[PDB]
Amino acid sequence: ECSVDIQGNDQMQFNTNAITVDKSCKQFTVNLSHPGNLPKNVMGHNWVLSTAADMQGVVTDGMASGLDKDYLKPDDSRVIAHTKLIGSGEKDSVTFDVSKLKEGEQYMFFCAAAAHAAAMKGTLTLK
């Protein structure tokens, strides 16, 4: 299996803080869903992948871009993979090539929604 299921909920939480990608997968899929009640503008989430090196920069410029851009600088080359921003009752999936991921590199996933990254983040690692 070359996928993971992850939820972002109304208490500003992902349901994992460490994802592992089997390094023999050609592609890997992240299936994000929102089990809450709150509207997208107040507790909307996305799942965003970057290097540890780029995480805060992505989060900072993302907050500048704001809700109307899904809290991501458009065409940000630092974002390896991301889902759409989703609100209550919604789900989005993103697939990327495992060849984008390098050995000897540190990757972090996080929600880019304003202020959410502090709580909503973890590591992604090939194994």
Residues forming a β-bridge with 97: 27
Q: Which of the ranges 29-37, 56-64, 95-103, 105-113 carries the binding residues for Cu ion, by CB under 5 A? A: 105-113
Q: Does 45 bind Cu ion (CB under 5 A)?
A: yes
55 labeled part of a ligand binding site: no
CB 103 within 8 A of CB 86: no
45 labeled part of a ligand binding site: yes
Residue closer to Cu ion (CB basis): 2 or 119: 119
Among candidate residues 79, 85, 84, 83, the one with its CA nearest the CA of residue 107: 79
Q: Does 113 bind Cu ion (CB under 5 A)?
A: yes
Residue closer to Cu ion (CB basis): 72 or 113: 113
CA 70 to chain centre: 12
Q: How far, in Å, CA of 66 to CA of 113, rounded?
A: 8
How many residues in the shown chain lie near Cu ion by CB under 5 A? 4
Residue closer to Cu ion (CB basis): 27 or 66: 66
3-state secondary structure of 30: strand
Q: In this structure, is the dihedral angle defined by the CA atoms of residues 94, 98, 101 and 106, taken in order, positive or negative?
A: positive
Q: Does 40 bind Cu ion (CB under 5 A)?
A: no
Residues forming a β-bridge with 91: 33
Q: Which of the ranges 28-36, 50-58, 91-99, 104-112 carries the binding residues for Cu ion, by CB under 5 A? A: 104-112
The residues of the shown chain that bind Cu ion, judged by CB under 5 A, are 45, 111, 113, 116
Binding-site annotation: residue ranges for Cu cation: 45, 120
